[PDB]
Write a protein that binds this ligand. Structure first.
Ligand SMILES: Cc1cc2nc3c(=O)[nH]c(=O)nc-3n(C[C@H](O)[C@H](O)[C@H](O)COP(=O)(O)OP(=O)(O)OC[C@H]3O[C@@H](n4cnc5c(N)ncnc54)[C@H](O)[C@@H]3O)c2cc1C
Ligand SMILES: Cc1cc2nc3c(=O)[nH]c(=O)nc-3n(C[C@H](O)[C@H](O)[C@H](O)COP(=O)(O)O)c2cc1C
Length: 530
């Protein structure tokens, strides 16, 4: 933000100073320069340019602004592309040309391509009236609602005031374990109350969930480094106790090759030095050793700033939305697989998933936003058939699909392929599926239980078993959806779809692949895999 003051007896400067003190209290973009010193030749690169000028000699500018005026009214003045500006004008009404100077600058700057931030404002002798409120909306219009440099806070969600950087403060209503006692996995059905926010979402969207690290994990980490936890550290320019920085502001539950390498170097660890510069060794160590355990295994003294400088900022996690608002109204449901594992007998857990499962009380606060996915959507035609492939937690959006199609009483046929280790332990939402089958909403359902018999069975095996009927549905205009594990499931499922298409469509592998690519183009093959 560049405030140019053009003044003869200092009134315009008093205003422009009154504006340097406002912006100074708001944004970090404020610099006050006199017109007589302003290097106008480089003006095009002004991101935010506010002019405060009085008027002299029948509309003549103040003396100090005369060169700047001639250079803007000159045949050689620069066109402006990324310049936002405003103009406040001072003068005396009794004169023929009231506020010529301020008028000139306002007209000419926009005529060079400058983005008019506010409408120009004039004022007579008694100017602390018009000036006191102009200075007001400028600070607002020059806040995040029209930024350039300092503080932006820009996000994207339908027409909402809520976004990833300004999330909704919601509350946790339901937190329920939906895998059986003998499951190898902890899966939670989560209902979050949206209150009166008006936050909206469609099936296929995901929920962005901010979280905090486990205070126990922060404490274990802080101790192993021989810190106590109240050491001050700088986080985004402000000063926090270490514990608060670690709990709220940095990733602790994900290790990376870079972190291993940096930590090896900082500590000269004999265990870790040998991995330095070997990307595959570093990645493998990160993947098997959480940060807190890397520290255990390679003790070293680090001060608080050295630790926090090691870490990446904390980021929210996404969770496919498992409800339809037509059915649940001012709520959002998710299906959370809690990452739980052990390192030499010490319990470890993913940050967000264990935050929701273990560290938020009923009615407890949860900060959320919507991640819109326009490329994962039910057909617009309520009669088009729908094929859904979502084993594990990939089941979530298909709960939302069926809540929606049932709410709309869509007559389209629906087909679910689901899979997990055990029928008696891992049939997520079994009793709802039975109800959908009973009610005629869920037309077909095929299940793959990978650990209920000797040989492994997965959804791709049921896709192959169902080849003939799948191809029939595909020729009836069916949309195919795949949600869940990217690394293995989505690939094996795509391979099985290609085999079905090749076989029952009578084409070779390259033709099947082009056919599936045509379904993508047609938005009839959509995936949300992660
Ligand atoms: C579009 C989208 C939709 C999603 N939908 C869902 C959904 O419906 N349900 C769902 O549950 N998730 C879903 N996810 C995944 C979700 O966003 C998270 O990534 C997941 O919950 C893990 O995050 P976390 O914070 O719990 O764990 P993190 O702390 O981020 O990650 C866990 C870490 O632990 C490590 N780790 C795991 N096991 C071991 C081990 N044995 N030894 C050493 N290290 C280990 C991993 O390497 C990883 O570094 C979705 C993701 C996307 C992008
Ligand atoms: C000699 C003189 C000529 C002026 N001519 C004009 C004029 O032509 N048009 C106008 O609107 N104001 C005119 N003014 C009014 C001044 O611009 C007004 O007093 C203003 O507040 C000056 O503020 P400053 O202290 O920043 O110079 C004139 C003032 C003086 C002293």
């Amino acid at each position: 933000i560049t405030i140019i003051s053009a003044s003869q007896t200092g009134n315009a400067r008093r205003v422009a100073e009154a504006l340097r003190d406002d912006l100074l209290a708001a944004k970090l973009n404020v610099k006050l320069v006199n017109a007589g010193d302003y290097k106008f030749k480089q003006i095009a690169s002004e991101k935010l340019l506010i002019v405060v000028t009085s008027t002299q000699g029948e509309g003549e500018p103040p003396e100090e602004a005369v060169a700047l005026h001639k250079f803007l009214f000159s045949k050689k003045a620069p066109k402006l592309e990324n310049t936002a500006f405003a103009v406040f004008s001072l003068g005396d009404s009794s004169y023929e040309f009231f506020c010529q100077s301020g008028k000139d600058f306002d007209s000419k700057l926009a005529e060079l391509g400058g983005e008019r931030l506010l409408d120009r404002v004039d004022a007579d002798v008694e100017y602390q009236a018009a000036a006191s409120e102009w200075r007001a909306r400028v600070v607002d219009a020059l806040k995040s609602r029209a930024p350039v440099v300092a503080t932006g806070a820009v996000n994207e969600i339908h027409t909402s005031p809520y976004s990833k950087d300004a999330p909704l403060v919601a509350s946790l209503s339901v937190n329920q374990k939906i895998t059986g006692r003998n499951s190898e996995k902890d899966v939670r059905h989560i209902e979050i109350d949206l209150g009166d926010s008006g936050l909206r979402y469609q099936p296929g969207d995901a929920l962005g969930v901010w979280y905090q690290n486990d205070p126990a994990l922060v404490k274990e980490l802080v101790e192993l480094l021989w810190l106590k936890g109240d050491e001050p550290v700088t986080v985004e320019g402000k000063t926090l106790p270490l514990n608060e920085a670690l709990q709220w502001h940095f990733e602790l539950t994900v290790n990376t090759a870079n972190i291993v390498e940096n930590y090896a170097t900082l500590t000269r660890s004999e265990t870790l030095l040998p991995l330095v510069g070997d990307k595959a060794k570093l990645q493998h160590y990160a993947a098997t050793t959480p940060i807190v355990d890397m520290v255990r295994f390679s003790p070293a003294q680090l001060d608080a700033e050295a630790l926090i400088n090691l870490l990446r900022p904390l980021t929210p996690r996404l969770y496919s939305i498992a409800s339809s608002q037509a059915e649940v109204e001012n709520e959002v449901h998710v299906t959370v697989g809690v990452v739980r594992y052990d390192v030499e007998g010490r319990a470890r857990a993913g940050g967000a998933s264990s935050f929701l499962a273990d560290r938020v009380e009923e009615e407890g606060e949860v900060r959320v936003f919507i991640e819109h996915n326009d490329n994962f959507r039910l057909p617009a035609n309520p009669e088009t058939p729908v094929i859904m492939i979502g084993p594990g937690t990939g089941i979530a959006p298909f709960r939302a699909f069926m809540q929606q199609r049932a709410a709309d009483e869509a007559p389209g046929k629906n087909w679910l392929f689901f899979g997990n280790p055990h029928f008696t332990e891992d049939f997520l939402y079994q009793v709802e599926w039975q109800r959908y089958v009973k009610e005629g909403v869920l037309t077909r359902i095929d299940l793959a239980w990978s650990r209920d018999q000797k040989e492994k069975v997965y959804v791709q095996d049921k896709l192959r078993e169902q080849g003939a009927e799948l191809w029939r549905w595909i020729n009836d205009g069916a949309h195919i959806y795949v949600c869940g594990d990217a690394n293995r499931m989505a690939k094996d499922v795509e391979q099985a779809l290609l085999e079905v298409i090749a076989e029952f469509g009578g084409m070779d592998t390259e033709a099947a692949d082009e056919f599936l690519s045509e379904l993508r183009v047609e938005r009839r093959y959509q995936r949300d895999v992660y």
